[PDB]
Design an enzyme around this catalytic site. Structure first.
Site, PDB file in Angstrom:
ATOM      1  N   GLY A  20     -59.951 -16.711  32.097  1.00  0.00           N
ATOM      2  CA  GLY A  20     -59.416 -17.114  31.105  1.00  0.00           C
ATOM      3  C   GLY A  20     -59.877 -17.447  30.063  1.00  0.00           C
ATOM      4  O   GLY A  20     -59.136 -18.503  29.501  1.00  0.00           O
ATOM      5  N   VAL A  22     -63.826 -18.251  26.911  1.00  0.00           N
ATOM      6  CA  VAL A  22     -64.354 -17.512  25.532  1.00  0.00           C
ATOM      7  C   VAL A  22     -65.509 -18.985  25.541  1.00  0.00           C
ATOM      8  O   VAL A  22     -65.006 -19.686  24.437  1.00  0.00           O
ATOM      9  CB  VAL A  22     -63.650 -16.714  25.024  1.00  0.00           C
ATOM     10  CG1 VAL A  22     -64.947 -16.608  23.917  1.00  0.00           C
ATOM     11  CG2 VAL A  22     -62.862 -15.659  25.514  1.00  0.00           C
ATOM     12  N   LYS A  37     -67.606 -13.743  27.419  1.00  0.00           N
ATOM     13  CA  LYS A  37     -65.609 -14.276  28.247  1.00  0.00           C
ATOM     14  C   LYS A  37     -65.852 -14.224  29.388  1.00  0.00           C
ATOM     15  O   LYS A  37     -66.301 -12.920  30.686  1.00  0.00           O
ATOM     16  CB  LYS A  37     -64.403 -13.119  27.706  1.00  0.00           C
ATOM     17  CG  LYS A  37     -63.641 -13.172  28.994  1.00  0.00           C
ATOM     18  CD  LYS A  37     -62.393 -12.523  27.681  1.00  0.00           C
ATOM     19  CE  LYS A  37     -60.994 -13.358  27.770  1.00  0.00           C
ATOM     20  NZ  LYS A  37     -60.323 -12.208  27.065  1.00  0.00           N
ATOM     21  N   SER A  90     -59.282 -15.839  15.635  1.00  0.00           N
ATOM     22  CA  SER A  90     -58.336 -15.115  15.841  1.00  0.00           C
ATOM     23  C   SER A  90     -57.456 -15.589  14.994  1.00  0.00           C
ATOM     24  O   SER A  90     -57.177 -16.682  14.279  1.00  0.00           O
ATOM     25  CB  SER A  90     -57.439 -14.889  17.183  1.00  0.00           C
ATOM     26  OG  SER A  90     -57.640 -16.278  17.668  1.00  0.00           O
ATOM     27  N   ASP A 130     -51.898  -5.572  25.163  1.00  0.00           N
ATOM     28  CA  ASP A 130     -51.533  -6.508  25.171  1.00  0.00           C
ATOM     29  C   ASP A 130     -52.108  -7.343  23.393  1.00  0.00           C
ATOM     30  O   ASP A 130     -53.009  -7.573  23.441  1.00  0.00           O
ATOM     31  CB  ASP A 130     -52.571  -7.759  25.678  1.00  0.00           C
ATOM     32  CG  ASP A 130     -52.444  -9.266  25.981  1.00  0.00           C
ATOM     33  OD1 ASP A 130     -53.457  -9.409  26.169  1.00  0.00           O
ATOM     34  OD2 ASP A 130     -51.333  -9.625  25.531  1.00  0.00           O
ATOM     35  N   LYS A 132     -51.212  -9.258  19.878  1.00  0.00           N
ATOM     36  CA  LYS A 132     -50.540  -9.815  19.539  1.00  0.00           C
ATOM     37  C   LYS A 132     -52.209 -10.542  18.871  1.00  0.00           C
ATOM     38  O   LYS A 132     -53.072 -10.393  19.590  1.00  0.00           O
ATOM     39  CB  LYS A 132     -50.071 -10.788  20.777  1.00  0.00           C
ATOM     40  CG  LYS A 132     -51.342 -11.223  21.524  1.00  0.00           C
ATOM     41  CD  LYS A 132     -50.873 -12.085  22.467  1.00  0.00           C
ATOM     42  CE  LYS A 132     -52.586 -12.562  23.632  1.00  0.00           C
ATOM     43  NZ  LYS A 132     -51.465 -12.778  24.476  1.00  0.00           N
ATOM     44  N   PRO A 133     -51.579 -11.996  17.201  1.00  0.00           N
ATOM     45  CA  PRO A 133     -52.153 -12.281  17.033  1.00  0.00           C
ATOM     46  C   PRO A 133     -53.714 -13.026  17.461  1.00  0.00           C
ATOM     47  O   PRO A 133     -54.491 -12.766  16.804  1.00  0.00           O
ATOM     48  CB  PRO A 133     -51.688 -13.713  16.484  1.00  0.00           C
ATOM     49  CG  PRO A 133     -49.962 -13.265  16.771  1.00  0.00           C
ATOM     50  CD  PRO A 133     -50.220 -11.940  17.609  1.00  0.00           C
ATOM     51  N   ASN A 135     -55.054 -11.897  19.629  1.00  0.00           N
ATOM     52  CA  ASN A 135     -56.043 -10.191  20.145  1.00  0.00           C
ATOM     53  C   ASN A 135     -56.561  -9.554  19.114  1.00  0.00           C
ATOM     54  O   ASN A 135     -56.890  -8.439  19.135  1.00  0.00           O
ATOM     55  CB  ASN A 135     -55.689  -9.321  21.561  1.00  0.00           C
ATOM     56  CG  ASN A 135     -55.663 -10.304  22.465  1.00  0.00           C
ATOM     57  OD1 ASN A 135     -56.244 -11.419  22.869  1.00  0.00           O
ATOM     58  ND2 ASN A 135     -55.317  -9.677  23.446  1.00  0.00           N
ATOM     59  N   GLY A 150     -56.580  -3.128  27.236  1.00  0.00           N
ATOM     60  CA  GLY A 150     -56.921  -1.909  28.545  1.00  0.00           C
ATOM     61  C   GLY A 150     -58.332  -1.092  28.924  1.00  0.00           C
ATOM     62  O   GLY A 150     -57.497   0.315  29.306  1.00  0.00           O
ATOM     63  N   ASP A 157     -54.885  -3.811  37.303  1.00  0.00           N
ATOM     64  CA  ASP A 157     -54.133  -3.501  39.020  1.00  0.00           C
ATOM     65  C   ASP A 157     -54.670  -5.428  38.574  1.00  0.00           C
ATOM     66  O   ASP A 157     -53.489  -6.287  38.996  1.00  0.00           O
ATOM     67  CB  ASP A 157     -54.331  -3.024  39.598  1.00  0.00           C
ATOM     68  CG  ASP A 157     -54.172  -1.656  39.882  1.00  0.00           C
ATOM     69  OD1 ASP A 157     -52.930  -0.919  39.372  1.00  0.00           O
ATOM     70  OD2 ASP A 157     -55.371  -0.481  39.743  1.00  0.00           O
TER      71      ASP A 157
HETATM   72  N1  LIG Z   1     -65.050 -11.779  20.507  1.00  0.00           N
HETATM   73  C1  LIG Z   1     -64.805 -13.462  20.099  1.00  0.00           C
HETATM   74  N2  LIG Z   1     -65.168 -13.945  18.491  1.00  0.00           N
HETATM   75  C2  LIG Z   1     -64.647 -15.354  18.393  1.00  0.00           C
HETATM   76  N3  LIG Z   1     -63.944 -15.591  19.187  1.00  0.00           N
HETATM   77  C3  LIG Z   1     -63.323 -15.401  19.836  1.00  0.00           C
HETATM   78  C4  LIG Z   1     -63.397 -14.157  20.636  1.00  0.00           C
HETATM   79  N4  LIG Z   1     -63.187 -13.385  22.187  1.00  0.00           N
HETATM   80  C5  LIG Z   1     -62.003 -14.537  22.109  1.00  0.00           C
HETATM   81  N5  LIG Z   1     -62.223 -15.264  21.407  1.00  0.00           N
HETATM   82  C6  LIG Z   1     -60.884 -16.877  20.513  1.00  0.00           C
HETATM   83  O1  LIG Z   1     -61.102 -16.860  22.606  1.00  0.00           O
HETATM   84  C7  LIG Z   1     -60.018 -17.818  22.220  1.00  0.00           C
HETATM   85  C8  LIG Z   1     -58.959 -17.185  24.508  1.00  0.00           C
HETATM   86  O2  LIG Z   1     -59.228 -15.433  24.524  1.00  0.00           O
HETATM   87  P1  LIG Z   1     -58.778 -14.973  25.644  1.00  0.00           P
HETATM   88  O3  LIG Z   1     -58.470 -13.621  24.766  1.00  0.00           O
HETATM   89  O4  LIG Z   1     -58.656 -15.786  26.919  1.00  0.00           O
HETATM   90  O5  LIG Z   1     -56.832 -16.252  25.639  1.00  0.00           O
HETATM   91  P2  LIG Z   1     -55.545 -15.702  24.342  1.00  0.00           P
HETATM   92  O6  LIG Z   1     -55.312 -13.831  24.519  1.00  0.00           O
HETATM   93  O7  LIG Z   1     -56.257 -16.285  22.974  1.00  0.00           O
HETATM   94  O8  LIG Z   1     -54.388 -15.887  25.036  1.00  0.00           O
HETATM   95  P3  LIG Z   1     -54.024 -15.182  26.460  1.00  0.00           P
HETATM   96  O9  LIG Z   1     -55.340 -15.447  27.042  1.00  0.00           O
HETATM   97  O10 LIG Z   1     -52.990 -15.707  26.296  1.00  0.00           O
HETATM   98  O11 LIG Z   1     -53.808 -13.889  26.054  1.00  0.00           O
HETATM   99  C9  LIG Z   1     -58.726 -16.531  21.080  1.00  0.00           C
HETATM  100  O12 LIG Z   1     -57.591 -16.760  21.155  1.00  0.00           O
HETATM  101  C10 LIG Z   1     -60.132 -16.301  20.254  1.00  0.00           C
HETATM  102  O13 LIG Z   1     -60.181 -17.828  19.112  1.00  0.00           O
HETATM  103  N1  LIG Z   2     -56.222 -14.902  29.683  1.00  0.00           N
HETATM  104  C1  LIG Z   2     -56.107 -12.946  29.788  1.00  0.00           C
HETATM  105  C2  LIG Z   2     -57.526 -13.460  28.865  1.00  0.00           C
HETATM  106  N2  LIG Z   2     -56.969 -12.229  28.144  1.00  0.00           N
HETATM  107  C3  LIG Z   2     -58.409 -10.848  28.163  1.00  0.00           C
HETATM  108  N3  LIG Z   2     -59.790 -10.505  27.776  1.00  0.00           N
HETATM  109  N4  LIG Z   2     -59.656  -9.966  28.185  1.00  0.00           N
HETATM  110  C4  LIG Z   2     -58.723  -8.523  28.681  1.00  0.00           C
HETATM  111  C5  LIG Z   2     -59.084  -7.638  29.309  1.00  0.00           C
HETATM  112  C6  LIG Z   2     -58.218  -6.374  29.985  1.00  0.00           C
HETATM  113  C7  LIG Z   2     -58.328  -5.560  30.618  1.00  0.00           C
HETATM  114  C8  LIG Z   2     -59.768  -4.407  30.518  1.00  0.00           C
HETATM  115  F1  LIG Z   2     -58.693  -3.898  30.509  1.00  0.00           F
HETATM  116  C9  LIG Z   2     -60.426  -5.761  29.082  1.00  0.00           C
HETATM  117  F2  LIG Z   2     -61.067  -4.860  28.785  1.00  0.00           F
HETATM  118  C10 LIG Z   2     -60.687  -7.034  28.704  1.00  0.00           C
HETATM  119  N5  LIG Z   2     -61.737  -7.342  27.755  1.00  0.00           N
HETATM  120  C11 LIG Z   2     -61.531  -7.040  27.285  1.00  0.00           C
HETATM  121  C12 LIG Z   2     -61.397  -5.574  26.784  1.00  0.00           C
HETATM  122  C13 LIG Z   2     -62.537  -4.822  25.106  1.00  0.00           C
HETATM  123  C14 LIG Z   2     -62.444  -5.800  24.607  1.00  0.00           C
HETATM  124  I1  LIG Z   2     -64.196  -5.286  22.756  1.00  0.00           I
HETATM  125  C15 LIG Z   2     -63.232  -6.762  24.811  1.00  0.00           C
HETATM  126  C16 LIG Z   2     -62.296  -7.578  25.787  1.00  0.00           C
HETATM  127  F3  LIG Z   2     -63.876  -8.568  26.925  1.00  0.00           F
HETATM  128  O1  LIG Z   2     -57.757  -9.312  28.824  1.00  0.00           O
HETATM  129 MG   LIG Z   3     -57.106 -12.446  24.129  1.00  0.00          MG
END
Ligand SMILES: Nc1ncnc2c1ncn2[C@@H]1O[C@H](COP(=O)(O)OP(=O)(O)OP(=O)(O)O)[C@@H](O)[C@H]1O
Ligand SMILES: NCCNc1nnc(-c2ccc(F)c(F)c2Nc2ccc(I)cc2F)o1
Ligand SMILES: [Mg+2]
Ligand SMILES: Nc1ncnc2c1ncn2[C@@H]1O[C@H](COP(=O)(O)OP(=O)(O)OP(=O)(O)O)[C@@H](O)[C@H]1O
Ligand SMILES: NCCNc1nnc(-c2ccc(F)c(F)c2Nc2ccc(I)cc2F)o1
Ligand SMILES: [Mg+2]
Lengths: 289, 289
Positions: A20, A22, A37, A90, A130, A132-133, A135, A150, A157
């Site tokens: 988790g 990025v 990611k 985000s 999922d 929330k701010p 995402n 999703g 799963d």
């Molecule tokens: N495509 C993107 N462009 C710019 N920043 C990104 C991108 N994707 C993710 N980030 C940054 O990376 C951070 C971590 O993403 P990640 O989905 O792993 O965790 P999260 O969604 O913040 O929290 P949680 O994983 O608890 O749901 C995000 O808060 C966002 O700031």
């Molecule tokens: N610590 C948890 C991190 N949060 C998270 N990051 N990616 C996902 C994710 C979950 C299910 C899924 F099917 C995805 F393609 C996922 N990823 C995803 C989907 C669409 C796009 I555009 C970009 C992605 F990274 O869930």
């Molecule tokens: Mg996220």
């Protein structure tokens, strides 16, 4: 062009959390900057080929409100999803620096979110799961886009928390939930962004006037499902905003609004009309432009 | 000798989960094989010097029932804790392969766990905070040791879930808990290991006779705090074991047993006396010796 592990190079780190993590990266062959990611997953080829196989639908996900996808691959104990770098980050990030996000801005955000869900739903039959701010991503061109939704059943799963839940009451309680569950999350996200902090527990008269400790895990989830939902504080937000989130934050999934109805609700129509420089406000508040 | 990032080299991966990931490594300068745990933490020097500073007490943690510590350091966005490699892994691991862990063995485990808590409590004034099968390590020399306990106040802060909680009812509900909370976790861990699966929800008559789906997040925590605690199934476990866990799994922290009393309870004394080849049973069941 296919993405490979060796064709990349780390530029910096954009954040992480719970899987988790990025990076801002450079795809050498193409020149593009991407967000990569990495999701760690100890698992058998059989599946982690399915996962990758299921992520390919992201290539077919094209919408001004959906974060762009480049490709996914597996590389020594990690599956990688590569996306458009959104240079605004985000909404949870902009909220820190912003203290609060203005009603007019959230109006534009709401329009984006709703068009994204709708797109994923009508054209791909998928719930976000999922919302929330963090995402919700934004960039300097003023664009607002959803990620992290999703697409992959096998990924759904192979993952299944925290201290702040954006899960609807129904989803917290059992298997009996679905797309309506995303509306709740959006509702709560807006009340958070409108107010400057996670809206549960709700602020008392004292904190309320001041603006204008952690909770235990069960304390929190028990509140969500057994106490009244949060409300936008009155007086300082249009009555239309107030009705919008209230229609969002209704504990009963079937009574709660759906996308159809939210799309034609006063606050949307009003926000639809309005003229705002989001690109301007964004860079102003986070120092970029 | 001080530990540094460059003095190491990865051998393999021992597992991960939620932070949160652990390698079997080689400390080149010394020759020792170690377990290196990496915890990702985006945070300001000021603190992540405190954390490191607070982890030094681990050097002073010496007990046949506590996993050995070599050192901690910080290295590009990760703090590292280096420990004795335990070649038997964690009780959650041995449970998979074992299907079930025999009563006599859990007896020896219980003795270990209790002596560890007691050691951490009397000589260092610290609660474990995360007792569960995966934070109990075993090796081929027949040793049973606890790791991952709460040495660092700042780390306690800078971390604060899942689908399986080993948190006591009181800790799930509020700030009003403390060391007695570790007893609950131990109780639940033993009923898990005794039975072959997470004991909540409890098995029905059908599954019970067969041995001899996921739950929602609130469904689970609501059960824990509002329904009766799990029990060892009767008939197939000594009455002393049954009383032991029952004394452990009492919802009220002050009514629940403490370490003093558990140390002199029938099942302990009986297990204390008993002659078992744990080293033998362990390698037998996981193929090592
Ligand atoms: N495509 C993107 N462009 C710019 N920043 C990104 C991108 N994707 C993710 N980030 C940054 O990376 C951070 C971590 O993403 P990640 O989905 O792993 O965790 P999260 O969604 O913040 O929290 P949680 O994983 O608890 O749901 C995000 O808060 C966002 O700031
Ligand atoms: N610590 C948890 C991190 N949060 C998270 N990051 N990616 C996902 C994710 C979950 C299910 C899924 F099917 C995805 F393609 C996922 N990823 C995803 C989907 C669409 C796009 I555009 C970009 C992605 F990274 O869930
Ligand atoms: Mg996220
Ligand atoms: N000193 C050690 N020797 C041998 N194996 C270890 C050692 N420390 C950790 N491990 C292995 O690494 C795995 C991951 O450890 P970690 O503490 O990150 O996660 P966990 O405790 O299993 O689960 P969670 O993080 O959800 O509490 C453990 O399950 C254990 O098998
Ligand atoms: N995904 C979560 C991983 N679980 C976990 N791993 N380490 C800890 C831990 C927590 C608090 C703390 F203060 C520690 F020293 C900790 N580590 C620690 C303490 C003593 C020993 I001996 C070894 C350790 F790694 O919590
Ligand atoms: Mg652990």
């Amino acid at each position: 062009m296919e993405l490979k592990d060796d064709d990349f190079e780390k530029i910096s780190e954009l954040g992480a959390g719970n899987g988790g993590v990025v990076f801002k990266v450079s795809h050498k062959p193409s020149g593009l900057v991407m967000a990569r990611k990495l999701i760690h997953l100890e698992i058998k080829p059989a599946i982690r080929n399915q996962i990758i196989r299921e992520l390919q639908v992201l290539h077919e996900c094209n919408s001004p409100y959906i974060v762009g996808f480049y490709g996914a691959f597996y590389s020594d104990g990690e599956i990688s999803i590569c996306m458009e770098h959104m240079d605004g980050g985000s909404l949870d990030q902009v909220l820190k620096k912003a203290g609060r996000i203005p009603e007019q801005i959230l109006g534009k955000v709401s329009i984006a979110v709703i068009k994204g869900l709708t797109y994923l739903r009508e054209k791909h039959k998928i719930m976000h799961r999922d919302v929330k701010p963090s995402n919700i991503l934004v960039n300097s061109r003023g664009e607002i886009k959803l990620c992290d939704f999703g697409v992959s059943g096998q990924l759904i799963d192979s993952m299944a928390v925290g201290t702040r839940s954006y899960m609807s009451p129904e989803r917290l309680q059992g298997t009996h939930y679905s797309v309506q569950s995303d509306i709740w999350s959006m509702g709560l996200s807006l009340v958070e962004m409108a107010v400057g902090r996670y809206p549960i527990p709700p602020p008392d008269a004292k904190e309320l006037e001041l603006m204008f400790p952690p909770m235990a895990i069960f304390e929190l989830l028990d509140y969500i499902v057994n106490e009244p939902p949060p409300k936008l504080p009155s007086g300082v937000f249009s009555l239309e905003f107030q009705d919008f989130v209230n229609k969002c934050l209704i504990k009963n999934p079937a009574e709660r609004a759906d996308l159809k109805q939210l799309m034609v609700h006063a606050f949307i129509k009003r926000s639809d009309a309005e003229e705002v420089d989001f690109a301007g406000w964004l860079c102003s508040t986070i120092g970029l432009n």
